[PDB]
């Protein structure tokens with residue numbers, strides 16, 4: 001199964017990805033995680049992406065497309081994958097469509113996780129993330145068992161720099177401008193499914209799982 005998670009900042013993509021890969025055991029491919037690993041590794045590409053990410057701006061398409069192309073060509077992506085936060089732009093969706101054709105593959109579903117703006121801001125304001133594994137929590141909506149500690153591994157929780165309200169505003173601005181072009185691209189392709197992301201975590205997954213389980 002070849003799946004795309006799309007959604008505005010805060011919509012619950014990573015949270016749902018954790019649920020999906022637990023049940024289905026396809027690899028989780030996140031462009032955000034790939035950029036963060038390039039940053040940890042200190043590469044030229046990583047260092048160049050960092051300024052965009054800190055500002056809540058999209059990394060330019062050319063770089064992003066090249067890293068996804070390389071990742072998805074690996075042997076572990078040939079029996080299914082979960083793409084999370086790619087494509088974010090019609091140019092990226094165009095390129096992925098070519099890339100997939102060259103691999104003899106196509107998308108099963110693009111899951112558009114829908115959430116109201118106010119809720120998106122409430123979610124990003126209360127978010128804490130494990131520095132080790134990247135699991136995400138929310139002070140109100142999904143707290144860790146003990147404050148400041150990841151439930152899975154005992155890791156330290158941190159606040160992402162781009163979660164500051166002024167940066168969140170820029171992220172929603174920049175990403176909303178891309179939503180309707182992306183929806184139009186995939187509505188045509190017959191793969192788009194809207195998911196009500198504004199429910200309890202496990203109940204959003206009920207809806208996603210209904211789709212995935214039928215594949």
Ligand SMILES: Nc1ncnc2c1ncn2[C@@H]1O[C@H](COP(=O)(O)OP(=O)(O)OP(=O)(O)OP(=O)(O)OP(=O)(O)OC[C@H]2O[C@@H](n3cnc4c(N)ncnc43)[C@H](O)[C@@H]2O)[C@@H](O)[C@H]1O
Pocket residue numbers: 007008009010011012013014015016030031032033035052053054056057058059060064084085086087088092123124126127128136137138139141142171197198199200201204
């Ligand atoms: N393709 C691309 N092209 C160009 N640039 C790219 C790119 N991909 C990445 N980039 C660059 O990298 C940056 C970061 O990208 P990326 O890391 O992909 O971040 P993002 O797209 O902004 O999404 P978030 O991680 O903020 O949100 P999420 O939807 O996964 O929410 P979460 O599950 O954590 O949940 C959020 C909060 O809500 C809580 N929560 C989750 N679900 C629920 C629920 N159902 N109810 C209540 N709370 C919930 C969580 O606990 C958490 O606290 C980009 O801004 C850009 O600079």
Ligand SMILES: [Zn+2]
Pocket residue numbers: 130131132133134135150151152153154155
């Ligand atoms: Zn952790």
